[PDB]
RNA sequence: UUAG
RNA sequence: UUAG
């Protein structure tokens, strides 16, 4: 029921006394540009994106120091997973999970 | 004596009743965006570009 | 969307 | 350039 523009990468957020405009591009062809005008912007960008230097998203005017300083101090961690698909089960099905100790 | 922004590729020209805004990018890093606001735009783009 |  |  929501209006969602997929494949739309925000590039710049402009926020002013009179309103906001958000500049985004098509991810499938980055030349194609869109300008979304609104009363307010809700930023949901991951902290990792906000941390990115040089910026992946530019804020105009620049965010105040008390905001940027916080973005720098906070940690943004990492963890990954490997999916292994087999045709046969060869492990104990009753065991939800088991470990492996490193050398 | 002129103000020239080199390495600035215009991507979109917006022209309205109240004025114009021109969206351009840095050719050396196309993520970096600029919005130039003005009363009028003079288009000097080659016919080949306009045909593209 | 020449945002309403 | 939160165009003036």
Curated annotation (Swiss-Prot), chain A:
Post-translational modification Phosphoserine, affected residues: 31
Induction, as annotated: Down-regulated during neural differentiation in neuroblastoma cancer.
Tissues expressed in: Ubiquitously expressed.
Post-translational modification, as annotated: Acetylated by KAT8 in epithelial but not in mesenchymal cells, thereby regulating the epithelial-to-mesenchymal transition. Acetylation by KAT8 reduces KDM1A association with nucleosomes, thereby decreasing histone H3 demethylation, leading to transcription activatio of target genes.
Impact noted for substituting residue 81 to A: Abolishes histone demethylase activity
Residues that span the membrane, as ranges: none
Domain of life, per lineage: Eukaryota
Compartment(s) of residence: Nucleus; Chromosome
Membership in a protein family: Belongs to the flavin monoamine oxidase family.
Record note on quaternary structure: Component of a histone demethylase complex with RCOR1. Component of a RCOR/GFI/KDM1A/HDAC complex. Interacts directly with GFI1 and GFI1B. Interacts with INSM1 (via N-terminus). Component of a BHC histone deacetylase complex that contains HDAC1, HDAC2, HMG20B, KDM1A, RCOR1 and PHF21A. The BHC complex may also contain ZMYM2, ZNF217, ZMYM3, GSE1 and GTF2I. In the complex, RCOR1/CoREST strongly enhances the demethylase activity and protects it from the proteasome while PHF21A/BHC80 inhibits the demethylase activity. Interacts with the androgen receptor (AR).
Domain notes: The SWIRM domain may act as an anchor site for a histone tail.
Function description: Histone demethylase that can demethylate both 'Lys-4' (H3K4me) and 'Lys-9' (H3K9me) of histone H3, thereby acting as a coactivator or a corepressor, depending on the context. Acts by oxidizing the substrate by FAD to generate the corresponding imine that is subsequently hydrolyzed. Acts as a corepressor by mediating demethylation of H3K4me, a specific tag for epigenetic transcriptional activation. Demethylates both mono- (H3K4me1) and di-methylated (H3K4me2) H3K4me. May play a role in the repression of neuronal genes.
The protein's name: Lysine-specific histone demethylase 1A
Record organism: Homo sapiens (Human)
Parent-protein residues present: 581 to 683 of 852
From Swiss-Prot, chain B:
Subcellular location(s) of the protein: Nucleus; Chromosome
Modified residues annotated as Phosphoserine in this record: 31
Domain of life: Eukaryota
Inducing factors: Down-regulated during neural differentiation in neuroblastoma cancer.
Tissue-specific expression: Ubiquitously expressed.
Signal sequence residues: none
PTM summary: Acetylated by KAT8 in epithelial but not in mesenchymal cells, thereby regulating the epithelial-to-mesenchymal transition. Acetylation by KAT8 reduces KDM1A association with nucleosomes, thereby decreasing histone H3 demethylation, leading to transcription activatio of target genes. Polyubiquitinated by JADE2; which leads to its proteasomal degradation. Deubiquitinated by USP38; preventing it from degradation by the 26S proteasome.
Disease per UniProt entry: Cleft palate, psychomotor retardation, and distinctive facial features: A syndrome characterized by cleft palate, developmental delay, psychomotor retardation, and facial dysmorphic features including a prominent forehead, slightly arched eyebrows, elongated palpebral fissures, a wide nasal bridge, thin lips, and widely spaced teeth. Cleft palate is a congenital fissure of the soft and/or hard palate, due to faulty fusion.
Record function comment: Histone demethylase that can demethylate both 'Lys-4' (H3K4me) and 'Lys-9' (H3K9me) of histone H3, thereby acting as a coactivator or a corepressor, depending on the context. Acts by oxidizing the substrate by FAD to generate the corresponding imine that is subsequently hydrolyzed. Acts as a corepressor by mediating demethylation of H3K4me, a specific tag for epigenetic transcriptional activation. Demethylates both mono- (H3K4me1) and di-methylated (H3K4me2) H3K4me. May play a role in the repression of neuronal genes.
Domains: entry comment: The SWIRM domain may act as an anchor site for a histone tail.
Quaternary structure and interacting proteins, as annotated: Component of a histone demethylase complex with RCOR1. Component of a RCOR/GFI/KDM1A/HDAC complex. Interacts directly with GFI1 and GFI1B. Interacts with INSM1 (via N-terminus). Component of a BHC histone deacetylase complex that contains HDAC1, HDAC2, HMG20B, KDM1A, RCOR1 and PHF21A. The BHC complex may also contain ZMYM2, ZNF217, ZMYM3, GSE1 and GTF2I. In the complex, RCOR1/CoREST strongly enhances the demethylase activity and protects it from the proteasome while PHF21A/BHC80 inhibits the demethylase activity. Interacts with the androgen receptor (AR).
Family: Belongs to the flavin monoamine oxidase family.
Name this protein carries in UniProt: Lysine-specific histone demethylase 1A
Full-sequence range covered: 581 to 632 of 852
């Amino acid at each position: 029921g929501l209006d969602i523009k997929l494949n739309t990468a925000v590039r710049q957020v402009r926020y002013t006394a009179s309103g906001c405009e958000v500049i985004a591009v098509n991810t499938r062809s980055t030349s194609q540009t869109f300008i979304y005008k609104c009363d307010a912007v809700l930023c949901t960008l991951p902290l990792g994106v906000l941390k990115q230097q040089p910026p992946a998203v530019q804020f105009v005017p620049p965010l105040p120091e008390w905001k940027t300083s916080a973005v720098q101090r906070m940690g943004f961690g990492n963890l990954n997973k490997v999916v292994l698909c087999f045709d046969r089960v060869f492990w104990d099905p009753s065991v939800n999970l088991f470990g492996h100790v490193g050398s």
